[PDB]
Amino acid sequence: KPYDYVFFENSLMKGDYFYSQAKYTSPSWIKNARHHLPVAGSVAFTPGNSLELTYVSAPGGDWYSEIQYCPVRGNDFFREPSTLSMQVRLRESMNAAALPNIAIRYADSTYTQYLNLRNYLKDTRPGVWHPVSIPLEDFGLNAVNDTNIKKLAAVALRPGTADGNEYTIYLDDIELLPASLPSVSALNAPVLQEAKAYERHIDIKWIPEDIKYYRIYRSFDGITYQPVAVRRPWMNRYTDFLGEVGKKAYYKVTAVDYALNESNDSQTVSATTYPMTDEQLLDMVQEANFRYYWEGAEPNSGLARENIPGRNDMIATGASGFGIMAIVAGIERGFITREEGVQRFLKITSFLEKADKFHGAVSHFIDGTTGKTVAFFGPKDNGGDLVETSFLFQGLLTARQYFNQENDKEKQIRKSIDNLWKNVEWSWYKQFKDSPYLYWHWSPDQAWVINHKLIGWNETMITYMLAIMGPKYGISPEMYYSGWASQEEYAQEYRADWGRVEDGKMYTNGNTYYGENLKVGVSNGGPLFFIHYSYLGLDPHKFTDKYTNYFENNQKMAKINQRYCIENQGGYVGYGEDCWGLTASDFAWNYQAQEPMPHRDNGTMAPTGALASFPYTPDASMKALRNYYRNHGSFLWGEYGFRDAFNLTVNWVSPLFMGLNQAPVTVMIENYRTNLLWNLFMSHPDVQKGIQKIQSI
Ligand SMILES: [Ca+2]
Secondary structure (H helix, E strand, O other), X not given: OOEOOEEEOOOOOOXXXXXXXXXXXXXXXXXXXXXXXXXXXXXXXXXXXXXXXEEEOOOOOEEEEEEEOOOOOOOOOEOOOOEEEEEEEEOOOOOHHHOOEEEXXXXXXXXXXXXXXXXXXXXXXXXXXXXXXXXXXXXXXOOOOOOOHHHEEEEEEEOOOOOOOEEEEEEEEEEEEOOOOOOOOOOOOOEEEEEEEOOOEEEEEEEOOOOOEEEEEEXXXXXXXXXXXXXXXXXXXXXXXXXXXXXXXXXXXXXXXOOOOEOOOOOOEEEEOOOOOHHHHHHHHHHHHHHHHOOOOEOOOOEOEOEEOOOOOEEEHHHHHHHHHHHHHHHHOOOOOHHHHHHHHHHHHHHHHHXXXXXXXXXXXXXXXXXXXXXXOOOOOOOEEHXXXXXXXXXXXXXXXXXXXXXXXXXXXXXXXXXXXXXXXXXXXXXXXXXXXXXXXXXXXXXXXXXXEOOOOOOOHHHHHHHHHOOOOOOOOOHHHHHHOOOOHHHHHHHHHHHOOOOOOEOEOOOEEOOEEOOXXXXXXXXXXXXXXXXXXXXXXXXXXXXXXXXXXXXXXXXXXXXXXXXXXXXXXXXXXXXXXXXXXXXXOOEEEOOOOHHHOOOEEOOHHHHOOOXXXXXXXXXXXXXXXXXXXXXXXXXXXXXXXXXXXXXXXXXXXXXXXXHHHHHHHHHHHHOHHHHHHHOOHHHHHHHHHHHHO
């Protein structure tokens, strides 16, 4: 599906808008918070909010503003646009010439020509939203399409007439649209299924034609409704964070087409928030994250999307393994029935049967509609990803132990998984017969070009575990020491290269951080997801190598991370006992692999850090959960659990939910609660054998 290339719809944060700039040279002025545009929460075309553009264009002064396109992982396919559409509202009547000049800033920081905004404003009456359409043509833009649209970095704004007066205009729904607006033959209300209240929020969900968005209406009395949110068609769900307990709200949803016609109302649903215990909070968090892998699954495969909003069709195989485990948990927790689960797993297993194999391994990314590998990370990564394969198969072997009933469907699930599992040629990923290491990747056409050795401490322990547990194409248990825990010079250098410290370059570490002596681990543990991914199924309580027991050591990493965060050397806003777990996520412009280390901390906290650490640091993780939900939920709690990351220091929250990050929360919560996934995985015969073999060295 194509996205609209949107510069602004709504700020997920209050106050100011991360993806904007506003600056000035006195005697001119533009209102800004840390050179970001203010977010007006009291006026909006698409509810939530709009951007406030309050300025003084004074003779001899200047101001500049821009609204920056927010890149989102996998947001690569867009409608071919012809127009820059905005909604513009003037607070006061004004000379139209005092309105801003407008341009588009390219990715290289050159600009289009500036146009007077007055020329696209039929009506300059204040206190009403005016649709504006600027043909891209008028900026002197040639044909815009997927190959070049991302060079349209920002909508730039400059003074009109320097008349020296203060004007406030509001800008909303700044986006590129096609010349021909998508239309719909009929514009029907979605079926609004229910409202589900929790403590601070109500979740509504509906079932759906190329509409623009759903508009959500809320009433506190059932009589008068106000528009509270919009949801794009890729989200059939809305999370209304009331922030208030015992609060009744009624909800009504309409569908809006690109012409901004509105369907009739859905049925009205209501719910009332109520106080929640920690148990209820765990349930809710597990459930919301589960949604990502259930209703949020790529529908053909049943598997986990890399991210939402992201590629519609691309599944991530590692995240899918995590999600598989989230789904098993979700069945046990009664979020879905076993039969629903079974149906999903029949689809999952049939799809994985058909997916491209690379010596039995899977690629990182697969197109869920075709089974074909997607070279999402570049043309070299177009074949097997053994680590992702291991994450997938950690999930599948867990599922295989779960679906143990003697019926034809669970038999088929089991059959399929056993065969998929047996046929992962782990040994192939040695590259050489005598390689001390597994390799991360193998390309069908470029062979070992990426050439990344699997060297711990990092996230890849389960890759070695599963490689060694593989019943047909297993590798020697010695590979755990020669590869994963390699003492070679090269492996030492590899560790120090990413770690930027010498600590843990010997696999073993032995240094103390925040009073915790870390037996194993690069630096003070690396991104905290290192103690999650390989330990969703592999029970770290039940694996001990010659250096350490892993629950003990992993738990130290969690505590170290929390203690770093409490200490908060960086002075980052909101870090503390209830806000910790530095780990990898997308941030504003790029991926970052954050750690409890100054050079890998910039104020960005991914909730998955603390939350998937539950089994290790339950109280600390429960504190995080409570904080994230009750204090930060207005921006941080969403339809698929917590947003991927947030940075209170720069006033940013992630626009996405990440396949990698949501399931660990469900799964590790579950392992803390019942040991479910651990017990499942650890009961697998091949798993037991491999562990025995490794521990007997
Ligand atoms: Ca808006």
